[PDB]
């Protein structure tokens, strides 16, 4: 594809990272804006923005995501494009190959070994995928902390983001997709909750003088 830039939507996450940017610019740009302006918004990532404005925003972020003044766009169109960015990745952020590994983790009998197994799978994620997921989960932790205001629990966020992060391969048995959605949602919920739990713990250390 000579002379044309690949854009930022629909391209592999690794091609959007480098030595100067461990996280894709569009991902950071979107998440940081929501953190700086939108964490108080009721139904954040739940409500949907206008289709046209969301489309316009994706268009603008395609050519050059840096120059995009996100303040000129509605908050639910920004959250819409974010989820759309995740869904348009050539491979889901938590990969096709490790999809079954995540299922097997949550199929374990007890919570502790479930958590440990989940984090064991995270360690094997490709570098770009781990960097992006890391940034995203931290963002969702920030959102969930303001659940009393934005009404977005870790469970709600999990339901929204799990299918964006984990997709069963097209060559899987569609008779088991029934339980799989519950399983991938549980996986993401446990991840957000444990990261938030550790957040709250270290936060009580942060908030002291000496």
Curated annotation (Swiss-Prot):
It is found in: Cytoplasm, Cell cortex; Cytoplasm, Perinuclear region; Cytoplasm, Cytoskeleton. Detected in peripheral blood leukocytes (at protein level). Expressed predominantly in peripheral blood leukocytes and at lower levels, in thymus, spleen, testis, prostate, ovary, brain, small intestine and lung. Residues 191-210 form a coiled coil. Residues 50-55 are annotated as: Interaction with RHOA. Changing residue 53 to E: Strongly decreases interaction with RHOA. Strongly decreases stimulation of RHOA GTPase activity. Changing residue 50 to E/N: Decreases interaction with RHOA. Strongly decreases stimulation of RHOA GTPase activity. Changing residue 52 to E: Decreases interaction with RHOA. Decreases stimulation of RHOA GTPase activity. Signal peptide: none annotated. Residues 14-199 form the Rho-GAP domain. It comes from the Eukaryota. The record marks 46 as: Arginine finger. Belongs to the TRAFAC class myosin-kinesin ATPase superfamily. Myosin family. Interacts (via IQ domains) with CALM. Interacts with RHOA. Interacts (via Rho-GAP domain) with ROBO1; this inhibits the interaction with RHOA and the stimulation of RHOA GTPase activity, and thereby increases the levels of active RHOA. Myosins are actin-based motor molecules with ATPase activity. Unconventional myosins serve in intracellular movements. Binds actin with high affinity both in the absence and presence of ATP and its mechanochemical activity is inhibited by calcium ions. Also acts as a GTPase activator for RHOA. Plays a role in the regulation of cell migration via its role as RHOA GTPase activator. This is Unconventional myosin-IXb. The lineage of its organism: Eukaryota, Metazoa, Chordata, Craniata, Vertebrata. The gene is MYO9B.
């Amino acid at each position: 594809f000579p002379g044309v830039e690949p854009g930022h939507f629909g391209v592999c996450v690794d091609s959007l990272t480098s030595d100067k940017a461990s996280v894709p610019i569009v991902l950071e740009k979107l998440l940081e804006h929501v953190e700086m302006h939108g964490l108080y918004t009721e139904g954040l990532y739940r409500k949907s923005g206008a289709a046209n404005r969301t489309r316009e925003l994706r268009q603008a972020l395609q050519t050059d995501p840096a120059a995009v003044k996100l303040e000129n766009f509605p908050i639910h169109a920004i959250t819409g494009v974010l989820k759309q960015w995740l869904r348009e990745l050539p491979e889901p952020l938590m990969t096709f190959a490790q999809y079954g590994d995540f299922l097997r983790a949550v199929e374990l009998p007890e919570k502790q070994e479930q958590l440990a197994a989940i984090y064991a799978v995270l360690e094997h994620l490709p570098e770009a995928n781990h960097n992006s997921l890391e940034r995203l989960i931290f963002h969702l932790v920030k959102v969930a902390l303001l659940e009393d205001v934005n009404r977005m629990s870790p469970g709600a966020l999990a339901i929204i983001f799990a299918p964006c992060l984990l997709r069963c391969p097209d060559n899987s048995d569609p008779l088991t997709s029934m339980k799989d959605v519950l399983k991938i949602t549980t996986c993401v919920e446990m991840l957000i909750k444990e990261q938030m739990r550790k957040y709250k713990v270290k936060m009580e250390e942060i908030s002291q003088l000496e």
